[PDB]
Ligand binder design. Structure first.
Ligand SMILES: Cc1cc2nc3c(=O)[nH]c(=O)nc-3n(C[C@H](O)[C@H](O)[C@H](O)COP(=O)(O)OP(=O)(O)OC[C@H]3O[C@@H](n4cnc5c(N)ncnc54)[C@H](O)[C@@H]3O)c2cc1C
Length: 295
């Protein structure tokens, strides 16, 4: 019943950009844009936790057409306007100074996307992925560990769980469990979707907990900059206690090099009860309750 590959690279769906808005506020590091595309005219359907491909125009340095780049869907299946007519992405402009000598490098697809104008036609493929799907059980617990744009799939979950319009549109899913997002970014201006995330926590204090790891504004107990692995270590016992529930699911996105720190913290917590985390975790993965998507 899960939609998959309704459109492929050889015959992509040609969508139209509706809006391209900045998510990084003044004083933040980098550029991250929220881009919404019109899906009318096609049959692209999708669910929370999936991704779509974007095929940028142009050729690479070898003269070959550019290939698709995958992006985690940032909107629920109904789209940001809950009209089942759009899809949104959370795109960071990739930019890095080339080693040994000044000159900055700009990622092809991400720069194309972050600077795209409303009305422009875009080649879209997908949806893709069955690794980050949300359980249908409204009483499940959901732990979300994310950094930067890794917030994308989490937004799809949280919006479906807590937006008034979503709850009205999803009679079959009235979330009543507990969800906890631990979000790591460099600055407060970099907290993507800050206002809406905090709105949700204020409205659902018993169903949603929000924890930040802001590196340029906070220090861990050792004096270093605060990162997501530090927050997990800080709340290791609480997280492990939740993970023990047969209905708890954990989602990780964007922790390229944080996963090891995460496991170290949970391992120490589980060890107190004579449990080897690495083994317990392997079983969670097999059971489909430990979801990971890092790149
Ligand atoms: C499943 C999945 C989901 C994703 N979701 C998102 C998302 O939601 N938001 C998002 O912004 N991106 C996401 N990405 C990443 C995205 O697919 C692209 O890889 C990213 O946007 C950069 O592509 P680009 O075309 O702009 O850069 P490209 O032109 O393809 O260049 C990228 C290349 O530059 C090089 N490079 C990058 N950084 C450095 C560095 N610091 N030092 C030296 N070389 C470097 C590497 O060789 C890398 O392959 C996701 C990826 C996957 C696989």
């Amino acid at each position: 019943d899960v939609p998959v590959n309704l459109y492929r690279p050889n015959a992509p769906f040609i969508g139209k950009v509706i809006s391209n808005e900045p998510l990084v506020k003044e004083g933040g590091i980098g550029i991250v844009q929220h881009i919404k595309f019109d899906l009318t005219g096609g049959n692209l359907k999708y669910i929370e936790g999936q991704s779509i491909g974007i095929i940028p125009p142009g050729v690479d340095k070898n003269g070959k057409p550019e290939k698709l780049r995958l992006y985690s869907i940032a909107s629920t299946r109904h789209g940001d306007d809950v009209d089942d007519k759009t899809i949104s992405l959370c795109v960071r402009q990739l930019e890095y100074k080339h080693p040994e000598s000044g000159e900055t490098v700009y990622g092809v697809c991400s720069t194309y996307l972050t600077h795209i104008e409303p009305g422009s036609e875009v080649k879209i493929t997908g949806p893709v992925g069955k690794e980050m799907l949300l359980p249908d059980d409204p009483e499940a617990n959901v732990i979300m560990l994310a950094t930067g744009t890794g917030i994308a799939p989490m937004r799809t979950y949280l919006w479906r769980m807590f937006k008034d319009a979503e709850r009205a549109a999803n009679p079959e899913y009235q979330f009543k469990g507990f969800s906890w997002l631990v979000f790591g970014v460099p600055t407060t201006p970099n907290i993507l979707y800050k206002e809406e995330l905090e709105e949700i926590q204020q409205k659902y204090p018993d169903n949603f907990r929000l924890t930040y790891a802001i590196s340029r504004e906070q220090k861990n107990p050792q004096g270093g900059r605060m990162y997501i692995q530090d927050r997990v270590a800080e709340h290791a016992d609480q997280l492990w206690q939740l993970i023990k529930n047969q209905k708890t699911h954990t989602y990780i996105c964007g922790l390229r090099g944080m996963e090891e720190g995460i496991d170290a913290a949970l391992s120490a917590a589980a060890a107190k009860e004579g449990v080897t985390w690495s083994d317990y975790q392997k079983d969670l993965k097999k059971a489909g309750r430990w979801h990971v998507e890092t790149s």
